[PDB]
């Protein structure tokens, strides 16, 4: 008996007659990649393929699950959304996900801190799990360090059905010096909690290019710890404010 989602199935070694089986367990402990699964001729082994399909079924489910309306309110966040109305349209209209809706822009100028130096924006993107799993672990330490020996920190708000380029409109609307977008990356096979950070200095919808942003990706327990990522994002925004540049326009 074996649960394909169990840790025992994830740590399975499939090499039949190994040269050094102890070394194989050393490689298996060294990576999350599906190594040391063996082979059946030149094809993958049966159990390794079965776990692949079981992980794909779980990954395809996380694509359409939205962060509940009660969760974003439980964090005391102002929820707002782009021009997208549902996740089916979100997958086919990236342009509509890069523009705030008509009620979105008005809600921003009404409830958010005007002309901040660091504006934090949290959005679902393509991974709800990247938001709900990593939030409480990264947001308190991020918004502390931005304030401890800090500056004018804007008001947080959640953007539903949002893409990365929508942070150029947010910085233009609020006049923010630095815009920090925490967004869930597209779902992987073994996990779907990967959170990313895209930061740009004083963005403009008409001139800001994608290379003007600094990217910190793979923020999760398997990757960069959300606590560890909070300290480096605060340090980043400090350097983007000192240098008055972001993306490839920064030194080192």
């Amino acid at each position: 008996a074996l649960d394909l989602g169990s840790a025992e199935a994830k740590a399975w070694i499939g090499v039949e007659n190994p040269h050094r089986a102890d070394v194989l367990t050393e490689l298996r402990r060294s990576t999350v990649a599906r190594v040391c699964t063996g082979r059946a001729g030149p094809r993958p082994r049966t159990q390794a393929l079965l776990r692949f399909l079981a992980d794909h079924s779980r990954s395809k489910d996380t694509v359409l699950k939205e962060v509940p309306e009660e969760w974003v309110k439980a964090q005391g966040l102002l929820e707002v959304r782009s021009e997208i109305s549902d996740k089916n349209l979100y997958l086919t209209r990236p342009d509509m996900g890069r523009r705030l809706c008509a009620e979105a822009v008005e809600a921003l100028k009404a409830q958010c801190v005007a002309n901040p130096d660091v504006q934090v924006v949290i959005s679902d993107g393509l991974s709800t799990d990247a938001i709900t799993v990593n939030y409480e672990e990264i947001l308190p330490p991020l918004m502390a360090g931005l304030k401890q020996a800090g500056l004018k920190v804007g008001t947080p708000f959640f953007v539903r059905y949002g893409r990365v380029k929508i942070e150029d409109q947010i910085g233009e609307i609020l006049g923010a010096k630095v815009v920090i977008l925490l967004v869930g990356e597209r779902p992987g096979l073994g996990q779907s909690e990967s959170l990313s950070c895209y930061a740009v200095y004083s963005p403009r919808m008409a001139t800001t290019v994608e290379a003007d942003r600094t990217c910190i990706s793979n923020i999760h327990q398997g990757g960069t710890p959300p606590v560890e990522a909070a300290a480096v994002i605060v340090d980043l925004a400090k350097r983007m404010l000192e240098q008055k540049a972001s993306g490839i326009n920064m030194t080192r």
Partner: protein, 453 residues
């Protein structure tokens, strides 16, 4: 020139060449998102017929982006051999398609004919080609390059070892390297996608890659697929140089989206000649894929197949060692399902081979698109019969960092033994001495990464 035809008694008129190029495309979600797709199957066929009756001069003199407004257009137009163009300028695209597909057309004939083409003409041929047309046409157009291994020889099949980690951890990266080498993967390159973009990260990943290369005297090359500027910087400061990588887009505004100038690629060519550990003459690596120009708002009303062909005209200028499209890397907003991803992978490889570059393909998909791993195995075999220069390799095709599924190390060994294909002759010699391969097939002790210990 004619921009109109009559199909079943109904007249189908089009505005310009850019609309004819776009509406002749097979149906994909990207052309609908751009508003340039045909409204029905009749107008798509009508657009193909009008496109097939246009001449090479009609499409060369009408680039989707003007000469004076786009440096990629200038590079494509400036690199045209005008003698080869004047020979074929009056050929209709229907005649150029039959010319490429003809068994009376040799490889040397195409070698001179493709110099009279532009990327717009290359895309025009792929639009009026069936899936078997794209496969057989590309098979008779091999492109051979040499770094520390020779790639693209008919009867051979290479693969890139892709060991990505969520934190660029050198223990996780090395573990996937020993797994890929045990399956015969890595004759294209051992290329790492970096989760960061700092210079000290790249050198640490490169030192790990080349520590394995120098340990077992592996004939191959290393690469970290960060931005080209920080690649140049790390190599300029002592990091071992092999292949220099940069993502490219078919327009100037698309290059500005990636932060890339054409002078950066000239510098990468000069840094490789002074620093890189490459025995051959080719050391550059580009990656493409349909939908990049549309994502950057830099397609200018052109379809994603024409814009993808402009990638190949830009890459041909720098004579790279390898180019591969990442056919299903972005999402379903540009390529929705199995049918569109296979069609794009066949188009991209055919256009890359017609452009004269060492065209490979990352047969891949994402988890928010309508596809599964059976799609990767379908396309990897179709492209292999088309003479695809190389594919990617990861443990079971599961990328723990890029959050997508590509081909497994099993998949390269499967294709090689199914179609009786060998690796690069330099790499095959190493696998034989390592006891991993014999007569192109994996030995009993192959597929075991603990063999290197």
């Amino acid at each position: 020139m004619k921009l109109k035809t009559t199909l079943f008694g109904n007249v189908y008129q089009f505005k310009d060449v850019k609309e004819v190029l776009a509406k002749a495309n097979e149906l994909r979600s990207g052309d609908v998102l751009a508003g340039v797709a045909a409204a029905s199957s009749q107008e798509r066929v009508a657009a193909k017929q009008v496109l097939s009756e246009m001449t090479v001069a009609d499409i060369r003199n009408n680039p989707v982006i003007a000469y004076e407004d786009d440096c990629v257009t200038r590079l494509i137009q400036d690199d045209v051999n005008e003698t080869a163009y004047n020979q074929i300028k009056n050929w209709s695209i229907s005649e150029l398609r039959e010319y490429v597909l003809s068994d009376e057309t040799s490889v040397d004939d195409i070698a001179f004919t493709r110099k009279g083409l532009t990327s717009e003409v290359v895309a025009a041929v792929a639009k009026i080609c069936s899936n078997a047309d794209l496969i057989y046409g590309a098979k008779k157009m091999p492109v051979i390059k040499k770094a520390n291994t020779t790639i693209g020889i008919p009867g051979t099949f290479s693969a890139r070892l892709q060991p990505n980690d969520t934190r660029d951890d050198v223990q996780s990266i090395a573990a996937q390297i020993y797994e890929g080498l045990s399956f015969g993967v890595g004759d294209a390159v051992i290329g790492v996608n970096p989760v960061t973009d700092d210079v000290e990260n790249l050198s640490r990943v490169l030192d790990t890659i080349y520590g394995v290369i120098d340990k077992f005297n592996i004939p191959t090359q290393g690469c970290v697929l960060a931005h080209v500027t920080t690649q140049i910087e790390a190599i300029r400061r002592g990091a071992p140089g092999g292949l220099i990588f940069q993502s490219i887009c078919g327009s100037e505004k698309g290059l500005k989206e990636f932060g890339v100038e054409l002078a950066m690629l000239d510098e990468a060519r000069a840094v490789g000649a002074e620093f890189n550990r490459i025995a051959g003459e080719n050391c550059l690596y580009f990656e493409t894929g349909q939908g990049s120009a549309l994502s950057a708002g830099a397609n200018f009303g052109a379809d994603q197949v024409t814009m993808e062909a402009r990638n190949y005209g830009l890459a041909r200028h720098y004579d790279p060692f390898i180019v591969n499209t990442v056919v299903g890397f972005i999402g379903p907003e540009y390529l929705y399902n199995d049918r569109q991803i296979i069609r794009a992978g066949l188009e991209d490889h055919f256009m890359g081979k017609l452009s004269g570059i060492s065209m490979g393909c990352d047969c891949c998909y994402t988890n928010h698109a309508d596809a599964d791993q059976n799609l990767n195995e379908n396309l990897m075999i179709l492209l292999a019969t088309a003479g695809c220069n190389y594919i990617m390799g990861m443990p079971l095709g599961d990328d723990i960092m890029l959050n997508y599924q590509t081909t497994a190390f099993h998949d390269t060994a499967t294709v090689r033994q199914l179609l009786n294909l060998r690796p690069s002759p330099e790499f095959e010699r190493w696998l034989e001495s390592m006891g991993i391969m014999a007569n192109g097939r994996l030995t009993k002790r192959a597929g075991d990464p603990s063999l290197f210990f």
